[PDB]
């Protein structure tokens, strides 16, 4: 099979910028190269065509240029309808493959998330369970890393992370990190800790509470 | 002018039993004839080993070749009549007659090595309900569509064989003379 | 005119087969090659087989195929996708994909359909367990502060998180779905000025359409 | 109009009805011309451009001809040309070059077998004219270079058809 | 009698360019020919999609279709000079003269639209020091083995572009007049 690179799979620009974007494959292929427009629940969509064809419906700040192995998708200035996953597409020999896809975000000044932490609730508490709940909203860029301290103890086991998409309106990012006990081992220990180091601060941020 | 003429051939061997049965008793077989025996398939664009569209089988030759010795005892004789049209006698181990014998097509053949062939024309099942045929013409004779693996049996032949004390063994070369016409060939690229 | 509808949505268990279909509209089949394209969740397009409706021409990608069996029914124009010894890792989206109608069209955009979603799960509806988040009494931002509820084990997905019935539905922040044992979890978060509450009461409402329920809790 | 700057190739089919020929009649006779009976002797299938001489980035075709329903898969940009190694590869320029080919038809009668006749005027067969189940004739199948303009062709397809068996209904009054 | 003539075909496009230079300048180019451009490989036990063993190639046309409007300024004038020895004339962009004029295998092509063919005989190259080859004869023309990919190149025709300050297309088909022999197929069994 062709494979096809496409770099870089993450990428970050101001609106009004231009943009470019490659894909590569380890042969040499024809007008068989299609670049496809993913966003988020939607299915993917046909973007150019013959490396450079606009395909129906595509507006005139997209291009694309390229010729054997070597193709780009460039964005004369950027929109934030713009923000998507771009994926390189070879029909030329099979399998057909696609590219691992290059996911465009919109840049913006960086900002520090707020952090939340929570207690176990009472009525899950009844149920013999405990989970202590962070939040880590609004910041940016998306690169975060938290950790749970247990009486300034690591605690890795029974952590579950989420983030949600780039914020449509500030286009901030946003985590939530849960860490689930039991009842009884919860009891045992005083000190619950959410530490979190973003690019935002070199003193990583910390919030922690005590039982009642 | 895509027209084309070729010899095509197959062969199989064939065994007749030894038979404990004093009285003499006869062996019924049948011969159906489809071209996907005789053609492999081809590969890439082509699906057909043969690049054409169109064919007609002109005659059909059956050979056939025994392996039983002149030195054998028991002797004995068949009978050989053409069938085309798929209503066959039945085929039967110990019939206690032969019922090729007062066939219009029926030729001789005798048993065990004796050399028989058969130089004639097919004729294949358009509908089994029907079945419809042409008379003797080379002129008028139709065209069938060179096809992938769905192509049509040619009923042939019924045959009969006296039964014997002793095996006899048949290779049996069944050679056809088929027209062609439209030379189909795909060439992709590189 | 030219529209590729695909089946609905498919729940299974695992070790169960399905049958996926995408109905062309506006074109014939006949005319070009269909494809089915897997997409897990996060991860990216993989392209699974060809068919050549006319023909019945087959083409797969090694992986999928023992697993995967791609079929057509030029008579309802009609391509189907089997898949068969599910497991979890089918989990993902399916698209079906083709063309225009010859004549020189290589082209008409794409119509990689609306897509499928395939869930191979053992669980059954499960409500959410829903738990309300209140803070422990510290300055978490100045003058603001930041509620929270936890809605856990349940199945399938989707729920609905509302504040406040609707009347709440800024600086809310709805984190997705992640499994656990087999379960949903998922936690909204609300952020309102310091001066509301404790003032005013916030509820969050939970609903759970596959269970048919609906639940509200209030912060303390 | 294309992009792609290697030679591509748009490939279509034709396939012809006579329902597309005919009114249908009215009140005892249901079909517009009176006869039981009808065999296409010619089809005579004619190519009027619209594309002026003027018109640059000029191309090439082949037209050869298919009697059997199994046709090359209809194709906007083919790497290259299947029609070039038949044996009834006719030749036709592009944009504005003027075609035509006078020849023969040949229907569908079973679309698992696809048998016909060879070139008999004599032993040609006879169709019943019907009211619209009328078979398709499997005529020609196309080729077209692709070029970065658009290239229009006002295509006349013309049959000479024999016919037999005037069926006329005169009701009274 | 397995003697089998058909006409064998491919086509390609060709650019001539835009030029800067006032005085009239020369595009040189060269043209050889080998079968395995005009040949898709066959699959199973036929490596190739055709069944002959030999082959010899009649005739070679070379056409000649230009995209090149009739509303084109800046007209010229080529010459075509048929080569069968491989020694060629250096492919050069712009040559301050005609290489191609004093040939006797001259003939001359206009420009940019004008219509051109040569209907003339190939000759392979058989060995690249000696470069020795038949007089025009039919009846003592050669056989060649149908080889899977090792096939010889035809040394075919030399050419010349009178350069010209726009861009000159050309749809260049190459027909051939191909003989054959020995019809070699294989059929592998079910």
């Known amino acids: 099979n062709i494979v096809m690179t496409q770099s870089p799979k993450s990428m970050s620009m101001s609106v009004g910028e231009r943009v470019t974007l490659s894909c590569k494959a380890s042969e040499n292929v024809g007008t068989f190269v299609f670049w496809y427009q993913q966003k988020p629940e939607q299915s993917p969509q046909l973007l150019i065509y013959g490396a450079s064809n606009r395909y129906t419906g595509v507006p005139d700040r997209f291009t694309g240029s390229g010729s054997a192995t070597d193709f780009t998708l460039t964005i004369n200035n950027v929109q934030a309808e713009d923000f998507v996953d771009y994926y390189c597409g070879q029909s030329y020999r099979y399998p057909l493959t696609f590219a691992a896809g290059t996911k465009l975000g919109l840049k913006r000044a960086d900002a520090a998330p707020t952090v939340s932490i929570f207690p176990p609730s009472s009525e899950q508490l009844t149920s013999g369970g405990a989970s202590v709940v962070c939040f880590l909203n609004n910041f940016y860029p998306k690169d975060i890393n938290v950790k749970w301290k247990i009486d300034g103890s690591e605690r890795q086991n029974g952590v579950l992370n989420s983030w949600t998409d780039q914020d449509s309106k500030d286009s901030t990012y946003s985590m939530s990190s849960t860490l689930t006990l039991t009842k009884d081992e919860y009891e045992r220990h005083n000190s619950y800790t959410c530490e979190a180091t973003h690019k935002t601060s070199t003193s990583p941020i910390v919030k922690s509470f005590n039982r009642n | 002018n895509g027209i084309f003429n070729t010899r095509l051939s197959c062969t199989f061997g064939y065994t007749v039993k030894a038979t404990t049965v004093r009285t003499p008793s006869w062996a019924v077989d049948m011969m159906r004839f489809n071209i996907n025996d005789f053609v492999p398939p081809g590969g890439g664009t082509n699906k057909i080993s043969i690049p054409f569209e169109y064919y007609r089988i002109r005659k059909v030759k059956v050979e056939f070749w025994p392996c039983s010795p002149i030195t054998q005892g028991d002797r004995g004789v068949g009978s050989t009549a053409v069938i085309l049209d798929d209503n066959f006698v039945t085929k039967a181990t110990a019939l206690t007659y032969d019922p090729y014998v007062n066939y219009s097509s029926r030729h001789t053949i005798p048993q065990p090595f004796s050399y028989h062939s058969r130089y004639f024309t097919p004729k294949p099942v358009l509908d089994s309900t029907i079945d419809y045929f042409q008379p003797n013409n080379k002129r008028n004779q139709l065209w069938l569509r060179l096809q992938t693996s769905a192509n049509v049996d040619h009923v042939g032949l019924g045959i009969a064989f006296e039964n014997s004390t002793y095996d006899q063994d048949y290779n049996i070369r069944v050679t056809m003379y088929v027209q062609f016409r439209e030379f189909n060939l795909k060439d992709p690229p590189l | 005119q030219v529209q590729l509808q695909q089946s609905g949505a498919e729940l299974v268990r695992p070790g169960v087969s399905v049958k996926i279909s995408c109905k062309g509209s506006?074109?014939?089949?006949?005319?070009?090659?269909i494809h089915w394209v897997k997409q897990s969740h996060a991860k990216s397009l993989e392209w699974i087989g060809l068919?050549?409706?006319?023909?019945?021409?087959?083409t797969y990608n090694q992986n999928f195929k023992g697993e995967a069996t791609m079929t057509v029914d030029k008579s309802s124009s009609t391509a189907y996708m089997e898949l068969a010894r599910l497991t979890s890792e089918d989990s993902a989206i399916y698209y079906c994909?083709?063309?225009?109608?010859?004549?020189?069209?290589?082209?008409?955009?794409?119509?990689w359909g609306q897509g499928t979603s395939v869930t191979v799960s053992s669980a059954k509806t499960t409500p959410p367990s829903v738990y309300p988040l209140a803070p422990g009494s510290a300055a978490q931002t100045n003058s603001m502060v930041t509620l929270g509820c936890l809605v856990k084990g349940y199945f399938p997905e989707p729920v609905t998180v509302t504040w406040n019935s609707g009347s709440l539905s800024s600086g809310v922040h709805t984190f997705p779905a992640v499994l656990q044992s087999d379960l949903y979890t998922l936690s909204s978060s609300v952020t309102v000025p310091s001066s509301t509450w404790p003032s005013e009461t916030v509820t969050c409402n939970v609903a759970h359409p596959a269970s048919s329920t609906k639940v509200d809790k209030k912060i303390v | 109009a294309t992009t792609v700057r290697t030679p591509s190739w748009a490939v279509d089919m034709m396939r012809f009805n006579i329902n597309d020929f005919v009114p249908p009649g009215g009140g005892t006779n249901k079909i517009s011309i009176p006869f039981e009976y009808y065999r296409i002797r010619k089809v005579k299938v004619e190519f009027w451009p619209c594309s002026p001489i003027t018109q640059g980035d000029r191309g090439v075709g082949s037209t050869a001809v298919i009697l059997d329903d199994n046709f090359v898969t209809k194709a906007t940009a083919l790497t290259y040309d299947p029609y070039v190694n038949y044996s009834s590869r006719h030749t036709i320029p592009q944009p504005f070059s003027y075609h035509s080919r006078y020849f023969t038809p040949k229907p569908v009668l079973d679309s698992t077998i696809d048998y016909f006749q060879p070139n008999n005027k004599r032993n040609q067969l006879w169709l019943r004219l019907q009211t619209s189940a009328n078979v398709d004739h499997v005529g020609l199948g196309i080729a077209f270079e692709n070029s970065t303009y658009d290239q229009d062709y006002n295509i006349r397809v013309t049959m000479y058809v024999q016919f037999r068996e005037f069926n006329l209904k005169d009701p009274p009054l | 009698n397995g003697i089998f003539n058909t006409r064998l075909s491919c086509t390609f496009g060709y650019t001539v360019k835009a030029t800067t230079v006032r005085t009239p300048s020369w595009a040189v180019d060269m043209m050889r020919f080998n079968i395995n451009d005009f040949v898709p490989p066959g699959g199973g036990t036929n490596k190739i999609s055709i069944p002959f063993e030999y082959y010899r190639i009649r005739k070679v046309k070379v056409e000649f279709w230009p995209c090149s409007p009739i509303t084109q300024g800046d007209r010229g004038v080529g010459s075509t000079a048929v080569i069968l020895d491989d020694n060629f004339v250096t492919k050069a962009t712009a040559l301050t003269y005609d290489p191609y004029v004093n040939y006797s295998s001259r003939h001359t092509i206009p420009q940019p639209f004008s219509y051109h063919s040569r209907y003339f005989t190939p000759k392979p190259v058989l060995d690249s020091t000696i470069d020795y080859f038949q007089p025009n004869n039919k009846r003592n023309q050669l056989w060649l083995r149908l080889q899977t990919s090792a096939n010889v190149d035809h040394v075919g025709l030399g050419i010349a572009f009178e350069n010209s300050t726009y861009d000159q297309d050309y749809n260049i088909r190459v027909t051939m007049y191909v003989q054959f022999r020995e019809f070699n197929l294989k059929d592998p069994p079910l």
């Open positions: 994909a083709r063309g225009p109608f010859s004549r020189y069209d290589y082209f008409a955009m794409d119509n």
């Open positions: 506006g074109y014939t089949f006949t005319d070009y090659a």
């Open positions: 068919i050549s409706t006319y023909y019945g021409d087959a």
